[model samples]
Target: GPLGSETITVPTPIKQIFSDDAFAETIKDNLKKKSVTDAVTQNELNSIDQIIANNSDIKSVQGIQYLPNVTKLFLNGNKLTDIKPLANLKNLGWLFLDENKVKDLSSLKDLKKLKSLSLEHNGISDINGLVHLPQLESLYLGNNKITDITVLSRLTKLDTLSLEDNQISDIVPLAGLTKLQNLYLSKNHISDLRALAGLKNLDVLELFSQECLNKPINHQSNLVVPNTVKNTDGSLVTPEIISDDGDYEKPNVKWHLPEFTNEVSFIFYQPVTIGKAKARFHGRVTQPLKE
Candidate 1:
C-alpha cells in the first residue's frame, strides 16, 4: 500500500536545561568568586543567594559547596536528605532548610556561628545535634519528624521556635530555654499544660489542637480537666465550684509544687507587651488555732 519512503516525526519540548547538579554548582561558583576581603556583619546576611525556582522541582543538594562568608542560606523546597556540606561553612549564621528530606543534622555541629535555623516540612528527627550551639537565637522545625526536643535546652539564646506537626509529647526539656519567647506547637501530640505554665516570658504560645486546654486548668494544683467531666456516679466535675475561696476553710496538708520555669518568650506589638508569670505557692497553708 506504501509507495515512496515515509518519515515519522516525534516531538520534544525545547526548554532551558542544564547539567546534573548545575544549580548547586552554579551557586557554589558564585560564592567562591564573591569578594569577601572585608569582615562580614550580622546585618549583611541576605536571602538572595539561596534562591530556588518556585516552580522547578529540585532533588538533592549534592553539589552545593560551602560558602564561609554566607550569612544566610535558603534551601527551601529542595530534595536534600543530609546537611553535611553545610558543616564546612564556618561563618554561616542563618540557614533555611525548609521542605526537604533532611533526616539527621549531626554534621552541622561545627557551625558555631549559626544563629537561626529553619527545617519546617523536612524529615529531621532528633535535635540533639543543636545542643552545642550556644549562639542560636531562633529555630523553626514546625513540620518534621521531631519527637523529643529536650536537647534544645542548651540553646539559651533561642528566642523563637516553631514545632507544629511533630511528635513531641514531653516539653519538660523546655525549662532550660529561658530566653524563648514565641513557641508554636499546634498540631503535635501534647496533652499536659504543666510545662507551659513554667514559661514565665511566654507571650503568644499556640496550643489549639492540644486537649490539655479542652477544659479548665487549676493554676493552684496544676490539674487540667475537661470542660465537662462525668464521674462514675454521673457527677460533673467542674472548675473548683466552691464558688468563693475566700470563705472556704480546709485542713492543712503538706504539698510542694514544681519550681516555676523562668523562661522568657516574646511578641512584637506597638508598645511591646511584656508579661511575667510566676507560680508562687506560699509555703504550707497557714491555719489558725483550733481553740
Candidate 2:
C-alpha cells in the first residue's frame, strides 16, 4: 500500500543525456540526492524493482526505460506533466501519481499488470484510458473534476474506490462492481441510495455530506402527498392518492359539508390515510374530518 525504503543503486547512463563527460558531471551535481548519478550502470538499473522519485522536482521523467523490471514507482508530489517515458514499464504493479498536474493517462494503459493506482488531487477528468488495466484493484481518484463514472463500470475487479469531493451524482453504474469493499462517496450531491444495497461485499461505505449535516432532513414528515383539486361546492375531493406509483393506494374520498343556508355552515366528514400524506399534512385530519 506504501512505498518501501529498499532502493537499488544504478549508475545513470551518461550517453542518454549528452556525450560530454563534463556536462554530465555538472548535471549530476545539480540532481537531487535520490536522482540517479552518471556513474550508475545499466546492470545496476535493471536490478531495481522499485523507484523512490517523490518530491524530486522531476518535470520530465526521462531515463526510466532502463528500469524494465520496476514493479513499484513512487512519483508523488512532483512537477510532472508528461509521463511518456514510463509507457514501456509493463511490469509496473503499483504507481503513485498523487499531488501532480497529470491530466493525461493515455501512456499508462500499457501497464496491464498494474494493481494499485493513485491519481488523487490531479487535473484528470477522463478515465476511459484505464479500461485496459483489468488487473487494477485499488484506485484513488478523489479530489478531481470527474463527473462521469461510466468508465469505472468496466473495472469490475476494483476492491477499493475513492471518489470523494467530486461532481458525481449518479452512482447506479457502480452497482455491478460487487467486488468493491471500500467505497468513498463523501461531499457529493448524491440523493439516491438504491444502488448501495446491491454491493453485498462492501465493508465501508461513506456518503457523508457537509450540507446535509448542517441541515438534516426532518424525519417527522417524510411521506409525500399527491396534488389534489378542490370541488366547487366548498368540499374536498381527493382522487387516487397513490404512493410509490400505485404500490400503496389511498381511497378516493369526497367530503361535503351538510347543506345549510343562512348564517351558518355544517359539519364535514371524510376518511383519510395519514401514511400517504406529506409532512405539511401532519395533524390536518386523520380521523373523520368534522368541522
Candidate 3:
C-alpha cells in the first residue's frame, strides 16, 4: 500500500496497491478502462459498491482495505483462507463467501451494519465472531464444521437461518430466536427438536436425514400445501387450487394425505387477505400452497 504518513499520497487506484495479483486483475476487469490509470478519483472507488467476482481464485483479500465503501461483495467459489482484510469494510451489508477455505471469523467482529451473510460450504468451526453484528437478518452456515451455536441466541433479529450438514446436537440455545421464520437443520446429528418448540414464527423447518428420526423422514417439499389441514376456526380448511399455471409435466398437486395429524394451529400469511390466515401443524408447520 503506497501511502505517505496517514493520507497524503496521490489518488492512485487501489488496484496498484492490491496484494494479490489475481485480485488486482479482477478489479481491473470490473473497473472501466479509461486511459489505463489516468487519475483515480474517490468517486470512482465509492461508486464501486458491489464486486461480483465469483470463482476468482482469490487466496487472500489483503488489498481490499482500499475499497472502504464497498457494501456488497460476492466472492463465492474462491480459494480464500483468511478474510482479515474484510474487517475494515464497516459499511458492508451483504457478503457471500461460500465455497471457500475460510476457517476463522474472529476478524469480522466490526461489521456492525452487515445484514445478509452466507458462509456455507466453508471450513468454519467457531462462530463466536458473529455475536456483535446487530443488523443480521439472514444467515447461512451450512456444510461447515460447527458444533456449538450458543452465540446464535444473540442474533435476535435473524429471520432466516440455515445450519445444515454440521455436527450440532444440542440446539437448546436457539429457542430464544423467536423471530426466525426459516430454519434448515437437515443432515445433522440432532436427536431432539424440543429446542425449537418456541419458534412460533417458523414458516419452514427442514429436519430430515438426521439420526434423530431413525429412518430418514423424507416427506417435506415446497411444491404444494396440503388441503387437509385444520382451519383456524377448528375445522379442516383447504386452499382452493389456483390452476397449475401450466407445468403439468411436474404439476405440484397434493396427491396423498399425510400420515401425521395436526396438534396445534397458528395464524400465518395475510396478504390482500380479509383476515390473518391460520395453519394446522401435523408433523411440522408449513405455508399452504396449491396442492
Candidate 4:
C-alpha cells in the first residue's frame, strides 16, 4: 500500500514477447527450475491426481503453455485481465484467482475435473457461469458481485464456501445446500444465518463481527417484543397488546429478541445483493424502546 507501484512479471505464450534465442534461453532456464519444482509439484498432484502453477506475475504471464501437465494453478496478485490460456490444461484440479484483475469466468466450464477454486478479490459478477464446474468442492468467492446463489443448488459436491465480502444479503437459498462445511459471510449484509442448519457438515461459520454491532450497556429492559405476526382471524394487531385465547393458534415468528440480562433487540433479516460484493448490515444497541 505504498504511494507508488512496482513492476512485476507475467506468464504469456512464447510467441507473444520473447525472440527465438531469448525464448529458448528462458525455456532452458525454466526447464532447469521446472525439473526440480515439477518433480515436487507434479508428484504431489499425481498422488492425489493434481497439478500446480505458481506464477506471481504482474500483468501478463507468457510462456506457461509448456507446463501441460499442471493441475493446480495459483495466479494471485497479478494484473492479467484475460486467463483463457488455462482452459487447455485438461487435468487441472485446484485453481487460485485471488487478488487478480480477471473479470470473466465463462471459460472455466470446460474444466470438468476441477475441484477446489478460490476467486477472492476479483471483478466476477456472474455465479451461474460456475454451475458447469460440477466437480468443484471447496469454493472461495469472498469478494465478487454475486448474490443469487440459487444457481449453485445443483453443485451438490460443494462443501466449504467463503463469501466474506460479497454482495449477498439473503441466505434463504442456501438452506438447500446440505454439504456445506466452512462458511464465511462476514463483511456482508447478512442478518439471519439459522437457515444454515441444513448444512450438516458445517464447521467454521463466521457472520457479522462484534465490532460491527458495538453497543453501550443499559440494564433497564430485558427484551423487545417482536412486532411481526400472522393473523388467523383476519384482524391485524400490534405487538403492544394481543388478546389471544389459550385455544387459539399463535402467529409464525421470523425473528425474536433473546431474553438476556440487558436491554437489547435482535432484528434478523437477509439483505438484497447488488452489483458489488462485500456487503454488511451495520446496527447499534442503545436504550430500550418506549412502549
TM-score computed on alpha carbons, candidate 2: 0.63
**Cα lDDT, all candidates:** 0.52, 0.59, 0.66, 0.52
Best model number under lDDT:
3
Compare the candidates by TM-score and give the number of the best one: 3
Model 2 Cα lDDT, one tens digit per residue, 1-291: 111222234544544542333323323443422332446554555566876767666676655655677899887887777777678887899999898888778889789999999998897788888888877899999888887888788999999999887877667778788888888877665544445546767766666541111122122222322222222232443432322222223323222223231111111122322222111111111212212
List the candidate 4 regions with Cα displacement exceeding 4 Å.
1-30, 33-55, 61-66, 210-291
Worst 10 residues of 3 by lDDT: 268-277
Minimum summed lDDT over a 10-residue window in model 4 is located at 240-249
Model 4, 107-225: lDDT tens per residue? Answer: 67788878988888886777787878877898999877766777677777887888777667566667777777666776665434445545656656666531113234333322323
lDDT tens digits, residue span 1-291, model 1: 111111112221111111234443444343342422222222222222444332234564432332235566776776667676566566678788788877777778888988898888877787788887879888999978888888877777888988877877677677666677887766665544445544657666665443221222223422222222221123332222211132212221212223342111111111112254222111111121111
TM-score of each candidate?
A: 0.58, 0.63, 0.69, 0.58
| Two-way lDDT contest, 2 vs 3, winner | 3
